[PDB]
Amino acid sequence: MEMEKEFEQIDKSGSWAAIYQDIRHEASDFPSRVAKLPKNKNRNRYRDVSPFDHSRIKLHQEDNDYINASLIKMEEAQRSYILTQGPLPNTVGHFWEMVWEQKSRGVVMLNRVMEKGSLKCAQYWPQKEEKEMIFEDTNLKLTLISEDIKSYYTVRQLELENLTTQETREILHFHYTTWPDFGVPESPASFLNFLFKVRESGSLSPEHGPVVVHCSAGIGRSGTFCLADTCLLLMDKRKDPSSVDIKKVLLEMRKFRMGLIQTADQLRFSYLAVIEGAKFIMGD
Ligand SMILES: CC[C@H](O)[C@@H]1N(S(C)(=O)=O)[C@H]2CC[C@]1(O)CC2
Numbered sequence: 001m002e003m004e005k006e007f008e009q010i011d012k013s014g015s016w017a018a019i020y021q022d023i024r025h026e027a028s029d030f031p032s033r034v035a036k037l038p039k040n041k042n043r044n045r046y047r048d049v050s051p052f053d054h055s056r057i058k059l060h061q062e063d064n065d066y067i068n069a070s071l072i073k074m075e076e077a078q079r080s081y082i083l084t085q086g087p088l089p090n091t092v093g094h095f096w097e098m099v100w101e102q103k104s105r106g107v108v109m110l111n112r113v114m115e116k117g118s119l120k121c122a123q124y125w126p127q128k129e130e131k132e133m134i135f136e137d138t139n140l141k142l143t144l145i146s147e148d149i150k151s152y153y154t155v156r157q158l159e160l161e162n163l164t165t166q167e168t169r170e171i172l173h174f175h176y177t178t179w180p181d182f183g184v185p186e187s188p189a190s191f192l193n194f195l196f197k198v199r200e201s202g203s204l205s206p207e208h209g210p211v212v213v214h215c216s217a218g219i220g221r222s223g224t225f226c227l228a229d230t231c232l233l234l235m236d237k238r239k240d241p242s243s244v245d246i247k248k249v250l251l252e253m254r255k256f257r258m259g260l261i262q263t264a265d266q267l268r269f270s271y272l273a274v275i276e277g278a279k280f281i282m283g284d
């Protein structure tokens with residue numbers, strides 16, 4: 001079926017939970033043996049969210065190459081994404097090592113450091129220009145260059161220096177600051193505006209390594225971001241945009257990381273975002 005009318009048909013019939021459970025039943029199951037080794041327990045935020053072995057990002061280190069991060073490679077859309085958990089106190093150096101080694105331009109953050117009165121990820125970037133951060137375990141230096149605070153999101157320019165080689169690179173930090181502590185946003189308008197700002201920066205384009213996107217577990221909000229982006233790109237590329245099947249795209253993405261889209265409300269919100277986004281592209 002088309003998307004917008006399949007949407008109203010699920011709303012009128014109130015069957016979002018049944019649709020979402022079907023997706024959960026059909027989703028891929030691949031091994032995640034490296035994630036479950038005892039030496040990696042303090043590298044995982046949640047015991048039930050792990051990267052598959054076949055798609056995990058490897059650190060370029062001979063001691064321990066493990067990080068909780070997955071490469072999502074979308075062949076028809078010609079887009080790749082790295083989805084990862086919010087960094088932990090003992091993985092902030094690994095996080096920036098990955099950004100460096102994978103040649104990423106942008107980092108997309110969809111959570112606040114504290115939500116619901118609890119810590120959802122480490123404070124992993126510097127908050128003042130004159131107070132830079134040094135990660136001694138991976139030999140990297142990180143400096144805040146500029147910050148632009150808007151009503152729904154903040155964009156930061158950061159300098160990452162590899163202290164071994166003295167090479168430097170500019171990294172863009174895109175921080176969506178207004179996702180509610182409970183539920184999903186009422187309108188997708190600010191989320192779409194944010195997606196378009198990431199796109200306009202070059203961070204999603206083939207001349208760079210894959211964008212790094214995270215929330216707390218790296219599957220819920222993060223899944224919504226890449227699902228919406230890929231669906232909109234496919235609608236632009238194909239002769240028949242009504243042929244894009246958001247459930248099929250989601251199942252393709254779940255070949256590369258488990259659990260993408262965590263609730264039926266996140267599934268409905270993803271439909272809403274793609275539907276509204278397709279009207280603005282036209283092109284309007
Ligand atoms: C009551 C929670 C359900 O998951 C609701 N469904 S439901 C029953 O299928 O209509 C959708 C999405 C989330 C929701 O609260 C609002 C409409």
Ligand SMILES: CC[C@H](O)[C@@H]1N(S(C)(=O)=O)[C@H]2CC[C@]1(O)CC2
Nearest residue numbers: 060061097137138139140162164
């Ligand atoms: C080619 C990877 C580098 O050798 C990494 N650095 S780095 C970024 O150049 O400082 C140190 C040593 C080993 C390493 O993988 C992790 C920390």
